[PDB]
Amino acid sequence: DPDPSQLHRSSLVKNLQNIYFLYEGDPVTHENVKSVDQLLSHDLIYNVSGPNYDKLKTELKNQEMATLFKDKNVDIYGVEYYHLCYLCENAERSACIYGGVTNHEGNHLEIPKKIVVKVSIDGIQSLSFDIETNKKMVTAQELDYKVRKYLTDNKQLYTNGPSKYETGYIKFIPKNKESFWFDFFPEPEFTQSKYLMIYKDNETLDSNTSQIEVYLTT
Amino acid sequence: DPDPSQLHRSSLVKNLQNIYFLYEGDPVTHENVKSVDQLLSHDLIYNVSGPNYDKLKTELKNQEMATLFKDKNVDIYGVEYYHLCYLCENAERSACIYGGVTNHEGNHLEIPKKIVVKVSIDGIQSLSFDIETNKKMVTAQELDYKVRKYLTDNKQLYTNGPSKYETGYIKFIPKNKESFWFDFFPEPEFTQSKYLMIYKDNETLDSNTSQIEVYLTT
Amino acid sequence: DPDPSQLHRSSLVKNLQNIYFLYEGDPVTHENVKSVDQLLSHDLIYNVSGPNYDKLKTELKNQEMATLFKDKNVDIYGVEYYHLCYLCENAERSACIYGGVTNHEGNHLEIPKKIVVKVSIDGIQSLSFDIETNKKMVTAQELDYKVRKYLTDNKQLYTNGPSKYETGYIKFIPKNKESFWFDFFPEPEFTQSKYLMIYKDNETLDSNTSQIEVYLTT
Amino acid sequence: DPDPSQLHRSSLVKNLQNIYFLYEGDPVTHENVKSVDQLLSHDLIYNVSGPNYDKLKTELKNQEMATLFKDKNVDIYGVEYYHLCYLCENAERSACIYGGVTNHEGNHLEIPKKIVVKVSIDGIQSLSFDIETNKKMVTAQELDYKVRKYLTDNKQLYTNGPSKYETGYIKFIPKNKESFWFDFFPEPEFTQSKYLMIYKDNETLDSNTSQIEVYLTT
Secondary structure (H helix, E strand, O other): OOOHHHOOOHHHOOOOHHHHHHHHOOOEEEEEEEOOEOOOOOEEEEOOOEOOEOEEEEEOOOHHHHHHHOOOEEEEEEOOEOOOOOOOOOOOOEEEEEOOEEEOOOOEEEEEEEEEEEEEEOOEEEEEEEEEEEEOEEEHHHHHHHHHHHHHHHHOOOEOEOOOOOEEEEEEEOOOOOOEEEEOOOOOOOOHHHHHHHHOOOOEEEOOOOEEEEEEEO | OOOOOOOOOHHHOOOOHHHHHHHHOOOEEEEEEEOOEOOOOOEEEEOOOEOOEOEEEEEOOOHHHHHHHOOOEEEEEEOOEOOOOOOOOOOOOEEEEEOOEEEOOOOEOOOOOOEEEEOOEOOEOOOEEEEOOOEOEEEHHHHHHHHHHHHHHHHOOOOOOOOOOOOEEEEEEEOOOOOEEEEOOOOOOOOHHHHHHHHOOOOEEEOOOEEEEEEEOO | OOOHHHOOOHHHOOOOHHHHHHHHOOOEEEEEEEOOEOOOOOEEEEOOOEOOEOEEEEEOOOHHHHHHHOOOEEEEEEOOEOOOOOOOOOOOOEEEEEOOEEEOOOOEEEEEEEEEEEEEEOOEEEEEEEEEEEEOEEEHHHHHHHHHHHHHHHHOOOOOOOOOOOEEEEEEEOOOOOOEEEEOOOOOOOOHHHHHHHHOOOOEEEOOOOEEEEEEEO | OOOHHHOOOHHHOOOOHHHHHHHHOOOEEEEEEOOOEOOOOOEEEEOOOEOOEOEEEEEOOOHHHHHHHOOOOEEEEEOOEOOOOOOOOOOOOEEEEEOOEEEOOOOEEEEEEEEEEEEEEOOEEEEEEEEEEEEOEEEHHHHHHHHHHHHHHHHOOOOOOOOOOOEEEEEEEOOOOOOEEEEOOOOOOOOHHHHHHHHOOOOEEEOOOOEEEEEEEO
16 A cells, blocks of 8 residues: 555646646547557557547557457547647547557446445545446446546546645555555656556456545645 | 639548638637747747647747737737647647737727628629627638638538538738738648648738638539 | 848857758758658658668648659758657658759769859858759759858858857859748747758759859858 | 567567667767756756767656656666657757666776676577676666677677567576566567667666576577
């Protein structure tokens, strides 16, 4: 578990709104789509449209993972960025994400699984809410975005300026796997593209057995 | 005027939507704003916010024009682009425009000195609508966007796909000055940052005494 | 002819060494090559190599100029730049130039033609030197490069720092064609890609009837 | 150690010469220098020159490492790249590297320690040679380059085209510490800037108690 020393201080961050706009906006979501191209051996390019893009590139873990989803119909759920997301200098309206991929066939639920998020602020676990997913195997990114979105709208985790909290992080607890975590704040000088690397491994958890804990300090 | 041939054929332009998205959307408009920085000698950077940018860079004719508006209160009105709009890796969420700058102090009309636009579909002077601005001195770019947004929203000038027309252009007839015209369609393979260079010379005209002529074909 | 007030001052330029490296290094030269691709409608891409590049893109005046040289065997001569020369994100070892393209078939001389350059410094043209070429129809860019290459090495026109001259321009006087000139110095804050735009028109002159004059001041 | 399946096949790589150029040319070496700037919190910018560059930005592991070397007098030994080395988006002549940073104070040797490299080919120990450094603690990058530069020149590990070997990796064996290896070949579609990330950790070994082994297959 994170030691207080290695947690990013939100007050040191210059341009914290750049994170706010990543988690305040809508995520890119598409279902039953298939890769159409590749730039590097570890990414995949989809022909999908959303507001602000008509092409989507996702960067996976390595070439092994990419070629695994290459000819499969998948679902994409991710947090995109547009700056530093080039395809060929001639392809405008492009969007980029890390991971956010899972197989379409056989991964949906007719009735969605609600995960109850245990949020703790300043040591006291004074908050809890449910998040939702209709996927059996869901990426940590989809659940992460959903938690931050709620905390943003309701508890002002992020605002178009400073944040309400100094430090904070989310922790996923898989049943048979090792628990991992993400820091809600980036380094003082950062980039959306570098911060979102936390999604590159494309870690997917079983929505039926996983737990989520959030820890924030004022 | 142009020799009906050198004009650009919409049918040949692949990825026409990219043009459409530039005029179908809202323009960038700010009043009584002052330049705050500069990347190259002929551009000016403003700290203005929009639903996609936190900074706006405007490229002007030459360093002389830029040094002219550098420390003045102006009105900005242009069509911004994002792909290939770089200030530095540490300045994402930036928008770029060409010209679109006018003096603010003394240049407003208590009442919009509306200008009449006479269209001409296939030679036969067909349609004719009304444009309007409350600027004594207004840039051709501002009037050109107003003239295009309309023709789009009501005559399908551009669409999320192809165009109702093959060729087409706008002719600007200033009182005492040579008359210019902008081609409505780009080259088959274009870029938004390259096509918007038609606003780079920051050509401003008198709203009170000037006429616009739009032509088209099918 | 330029007015003294219009010439850019070298003392005002920051990072002038960036121009120095442009004209002190070797130019990119290739003979009898054919365009292998194309990015935008007005450029051409060649699969040619040199130290630092395995691909070369040349930007011409417009699409008419581009489509004219497309399927032809041309000769290339230009001053290349790398920063802001993007091909498709994974096209490392790529170079960019403006124009510098001439037809290959029947445009060469058995014996190189010598062209005298009259170099006037502070109003006194007490210097003359030689420039050579084996092209009948040569580009201004090729002659201009050869001039500055000689002036840099012999007269310290450019150095890895300041220039020995405040101003200076090259004037090309073609036989029965109007003369043109290029300013040796850029605006204070500049980029290599924007300054080299002087060659974009691909202006070519007759090496038999063309004269060159260089005006410098200290 | 890597299971043969784990190693990248060189025959599958498109543009394997982009690797060749990285290790055939001279590295960027600078001793006793101090960082003058910073773009992102995990990088350091140095005002040092070499051919093709006037600025050098080194990307380290995280912000702690960067702040750790920030104001110290360091030595730099790295393998640079230029494509995608975005700095100010108006700063040409920049070279980028990863790590390759060691403290200058109290780290040199009177006599350069020589390290023996054992090269096994197709499983048979077939060649041993010498590499040398004047540093007590040296980056794995420095030694890696030294090893590869020798094997390239003498055994055609890489060439401007294909390589003699199908797979190959280098194994660093420190005294008290776990060993680690670097694959000599990249994924089929790679980028110099992504491939060179094997040096981001800035791992440094003791030049007096470390061994190097190289395994190649044809």
